[PDB]
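WARN  no MSA supplied for this record, continuing single-sequence
INFO  ligand: sodium ion
INFO  echoing inputs
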Amino acid sequence: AATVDLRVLETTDLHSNMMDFDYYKDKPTEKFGLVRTASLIIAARQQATNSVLVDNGDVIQGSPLGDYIAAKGLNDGEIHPVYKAMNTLDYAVGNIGNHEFNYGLDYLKKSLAGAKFPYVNANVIDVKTGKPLFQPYLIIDTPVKDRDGKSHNLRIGYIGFVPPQVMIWDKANLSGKVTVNDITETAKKWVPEMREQGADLVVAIPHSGLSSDPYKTMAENSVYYLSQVPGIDAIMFGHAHGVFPSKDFAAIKGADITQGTLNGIPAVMPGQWGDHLGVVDFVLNNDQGKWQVIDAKAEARPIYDKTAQKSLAAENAKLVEVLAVDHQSTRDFVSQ
Ligand SMILES: [Fe+3]
Ligand SMILES: [Fe+3]
Ligand code: NA
Ligand code: NA
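INFO  complex generated
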C-alpha cells in the first residue's frame, strides 16, 4: 500500500563547460555552465523526497577547459576538472557520449577512472572478446521513502548507449579495436535480462536524438524506437542539443509535449552546455507486490528565462571554488 514519488535528474552535452564563463570573450555568462546547472540540481532535490542524477555524455570535450586538459594530459596526479566538479554533485551513473572517444581509448579510460560514479555503455563491443568493452548496465539498490515516510529498497537499472557513427567520427581511434551495435537491438537484448535480474525500474540513457522516421538499423537518433521497447520506464537522452519536451517535437509520432512522454514513456533532452536540467517524475505503487509506474512526467528546466530575460539558477559558489585554479589555467591556455 506504499506510494513513492521518484525524480530522475539528467545533465547532457556539458562539453566541458564547467564555468559560466566565455573564455573567448573573457567574460562571465548567465546562459551556460555546470556551476549554474548545479543550482537547478540542488533546488530539484529539495522539492523531491527521492531523486537520482545521471549524465548523458559529451562531457570531457568541446570547450576551452576540455581543450586545455586534452593538451595537458592526465599524467600530473590530477583527475579531469569535469570530474572534480561532478564528483561533488552526487551522480548515480554516467553514460558515454560520442566525443568521449575523441582523444583515444586510453585517454577515455584515464578520464573515467577519476569519476566518483560508475559508467555504463552497452553497444560498444571489444573486437578481441566479441563482448561489451564497458559495463552494459548496472542495477543499483536505492533507498527511497514513500508518502507516509516509510523506507523501501528500489532496484534501479541503468543502461547506456552511444551512436554507431562513432566508427566514422573516431575511425582512427576505434576501427579494428571496437564495433558498435544498433541502439534498439542492444536494448532488446539487455532490457529483458535487467528485469529478470530484478530491476524494478529501467532508466535508459542513450546519447542519441529523436526521430519518428521509419526505423533502419544503425540509426544515429533512436529514442523513438527505444520508447517502443518493452520494459524501459524512462529515457534520459541527448546528442541533438535540442530541448525535449518542447514544441520543436510536436510532430513526433506518439509525443505528448505537455506531459513529456513518447508512447507513454517519459523522456527528456536537456539542451546543451548545462543550459537545462532534465527532470523525470514518477509515481510508483506496490499495491499488488511489484512496483508499478502509475504516473510519469518529464520536463527540461532552463537556467535562464528568455522571456523575462533573467537568471533562474545562481552561480554556485562552492563549485566555483572547486574550479578556481582550473578556471585561471583555462584563461592562460586561451591567451597563450
Ligand atoms: Fe554534444
Ligand atoms: Fe553527441
Ligand atoms: Na538522492
Ligand atoms: Na501515464
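Residues 13, 15, 58, 239, 241 surround fe (iii) ion (ligand 1) (CB under 6 Å).
INFO  checksum written, moving to next record
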